[PDB]
Amino acid sequence: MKQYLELMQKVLDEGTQKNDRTGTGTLSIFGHQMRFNLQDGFPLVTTKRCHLRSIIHELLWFLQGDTNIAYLHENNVTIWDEWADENGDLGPVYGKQWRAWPTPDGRHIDQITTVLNQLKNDPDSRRIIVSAWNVGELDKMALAPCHAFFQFYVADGKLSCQLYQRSCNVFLGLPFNIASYALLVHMMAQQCDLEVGDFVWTGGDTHLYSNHMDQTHLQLSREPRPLPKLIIKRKPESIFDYRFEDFEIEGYDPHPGIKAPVAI
Amino acid sequence: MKQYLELMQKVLDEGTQKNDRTGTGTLSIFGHQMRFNLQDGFPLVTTKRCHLRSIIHELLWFLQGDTNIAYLHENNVTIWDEWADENGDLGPVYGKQWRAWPTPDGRHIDQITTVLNQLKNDPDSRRIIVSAWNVGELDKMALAPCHAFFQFYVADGKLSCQLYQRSCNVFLGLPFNIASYALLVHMMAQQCDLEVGDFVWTGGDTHLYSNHMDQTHLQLSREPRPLPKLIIKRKPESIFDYRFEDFEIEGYDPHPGIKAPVAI
Ligand SMILES: C#CCN(Cc1ccc2[nH]c(N)nc(=O)c2c1)c1ccc(C(=O)N[C@@H](CCC(=O)O)C(=O)O)cc1
Ligand SMILES: C#CCN(Cc1ccc2[nH]c(N)nc(=O)c2c1)c1ccc(C(=O)N[C@@H](CCC(=O)O)C(=O)O)cc1
Ligand SMILES: *c1cc(=O)[nH]c(=O)n1[C@H]1C[C@H](O)[C@@H](COP(=O)(O)O)O1
Ligand SMILES: *c1cc(=O)[nH]c(=O)n1[C@H]1C[C@H](O)[C@@H](COP(=O)(O)O)O1
């Protein structure tokens, strides 16, 4: 996508070389924002082929309030294998925080249910937010939440959403994150009888790992193709009742996939 | 300021009329980001007179982990009066979360200290974050946190900070918010022997109240003057040891003030 490629070029041209936790090294910039009008099409990168199966199943896994990769394995998803323990658990990550944020007094908060009820009963609210950044449980998580906090918005019957990603791997993670959230927006909109609006992505440490330079340069020469369209085959009883078989990506003609190692 | 005035013009040009909690009515846009190079000068609005007295005392109050307005009162600052109860309490708001975020296992995390330790020992970390958005205690707060999340970054020996403000009252609150955080960066930088970098402001529901339109247009007809200079006269033992007297703002020649009502 245009916005995406522009960010890549920006990182290359303005990035500062930074030594990081993985000891790999990165070209890094701080503070960036991009908007995706969802009416124009599903923001799925076409400059390289993206794997929808992994994107969809992970999101359904989140809404389940699940933190064990068992589910992902049943569906041949391995994106979280490098961080799961001997038993497949990742600690109280995303899923746990979304569906059952632990209060100091022992109670639990279902942020998704709250959001649904807010969108349905009080759309003008400026407090429709879901946070995965539970300071009190960060030590128990296998990896700190990258896409840590998001806010919904409603105007003229359209549902928008802004995501704050504290850390971003432009080449590997960013394409996955965009599509994942854009998908959530569509699911929320359908469940709340609202049209889709804009997906606003805001990031903190936006970077490109040194060992991805060639891949990036290759992708930057490929002209972006028209954006695909998402089709939701069925309207479930609730936001928690979606199945992988309910989504269709029409008109997705991407360029060949580009391989690159992951940093652990 | 240029960025500030341009934001106001954007809200007016692309804002949607929207009803709100206070029952006042607002013009609103969702998603915005602007950057302030702190080396250029202290980002204090000159198109209208602002009063440091309240900005500084509030920040010091925050750092103390204080949530009762008694302190503010002793120093003749009334900005928070309308939301405090009979005992002057506001609930576990900013100060409390910053200095003692409650964990489910009985612990309390001092986010400010954690950040200081990170800036010195691991400045390349992509997790240097302070969050006031405590989902589990929002119900005990007098008002949900507007400026609820911020991340620090270091590059070229300069300290930058990005703030995510979920809700923003462009005319009243923003001028305070910008100066408050720019001040925090200066204090942090001095304590970590770093230079000041950029303050990146990101907003969710950025709006202007219907009853602030004339004030807004009056301000827009003014030419921004040179930015003031911040002079810290002392280097305290810790970030929690600063006093009002330690700060000196010079070169501040602002336009006349423009009074406007606060939405409760
Ligand atoms: C974001 C996010 C979720 N995640 C989780 C996640 C967790 C830690 C991380 N750590 C680092 N350094 N970078 C990441 O992008 C990253 C991503 C992802 C995990 C793997 C792939 C990945 O390797 N992509 C392959 C396809 C693999 C497959 O489908 O089997 C690709 O080349 O596209 C992408 C995203
Ligand atoms: C941000 C922040 C902190 N806050 C707290 C705070 C709490 C609730 C809010 N509610 C609304 N609707 N808008 C706000 O900006 C807002 C701000 C502020 C509160 C009041 C003033 C204010 O009254 N401004 C007057 C000066 C009054 C004085 O000197 O005491 C002005 O004319 O500017 C500024 C900031
Ligand atoms: C985390 C998970 C995700 O969905 N998307 C991402 O981009 N990431 C990345 C960010 C960074 O590349 C790597 C490590 O982050 P950190 O060292 O813990 O700060 O994961
Ligand atoms: C809150 C506190 C501050 O620092 N600055 C701000 O702009 N605000 C504003 C946001 C909004 O106008 C009002 C809070 O109302 P709500 O919770 O968003 O409904 O104060």
Q: Are A40 and A223 in contact (CB under 8 A)?
A: no
Our answer to whether residue B192 is catalytic in this structure is: no
The residues near A207 (Cβ < 8 Å, ≥ 6 apart) are A11, A15, A18, A20, A26, A27, A28, A29, A167, A168, A169, A170
Sign of CA dihedral B78, B84, B89, B92: negative
Which one, of B227, B165, B93, B162, lies nearest residue A30 by Cα?
B162
Q: Which of B227-230's residues contact partners 24+ apart within 8 Å by CB, and which partners?
A: B227/B1, B227/B40, B227/B41, B227/B42, B227/B43, B227/B44, B227/B46, B227/B251, B228/B41, B228/B42, B228/B44, B228/B46, B228/B252, B229/B41, B229/B42, B230/B42, B230/B183, B230/B186
Residues of chain A contacting B32 with CB distance shorter than 8 Å: 33
Tell me which residue has tokens 């009066």. Answer: B81
Which atom of ligand 1 lies at the shortest distance from residue A171's CA?
Answer: 15
- Do the chains contact at A205 and B107, CB–CB below 8 Å? no
Q: Are A63 and A99 in contact (CB under 8 A)?
A: yes
Question: How many CB pairs below 8 A link A and B?
Answer: 137
Mutate: best of A28, A34, A126, A199, partner B, most B CBs <10 A: A126
Which one, of B1, B3, B4, B10, lies nearest residue B30 by Cα?
B10
- Do the chains contact at A131 and B133, CB–CB below 8 Å? yes
Kind of pairing between the strands at B195-209 and B158-169: parallel
Which one, of A264, A10, A54, lies nearest residue A175 by Cα?
A54
Separation of CA B128 and ligand 3 centre (Å): 14
Cβ-count burial of B139 within 10 angstroms (0-12 exposed, 13-18 middle, 19+ buried)? exposed
Separation of CA B127 and ligand 3 centre (Å): 10
User: CA-nearest residue of chain B to A166?
Assistant: B126
User: Distance between CA A184 and CA B141 in Å, rounded?
Assistant: 29
Q: Distance between alpha carbon A231 and the CA centroid of its chain, in Å?
A: 19
The tally of domains found in chain A comes to: 1
Per-residue CA distances from A134 to A60, A137, B87, B134, B185 (Å): 21, 6, 30, 8, 24
- Do the chains contact at B164 and A160, CB–CB below 8 Å? no
Separation of CA A65 and ligand 3 centre (Å): 21
The DSSP line for A196-219 is EEEEEEEEEEEEEEGGGHHHHHHH
> Whole domain around residue B166: which residue ranges?
2-264
User: CA-nearest residue of chain B to A106?
Assistant: B104
CATH number of the domain that residue B43 is part of: 3.30.572.10
H helical segments located in chain B: 2-14, 52-63, 70-74, 94-100, 111-121, 173-191, 213-220
Resolution in A: 2.2
Closest CA of chain A from B74, distance in Å? 32
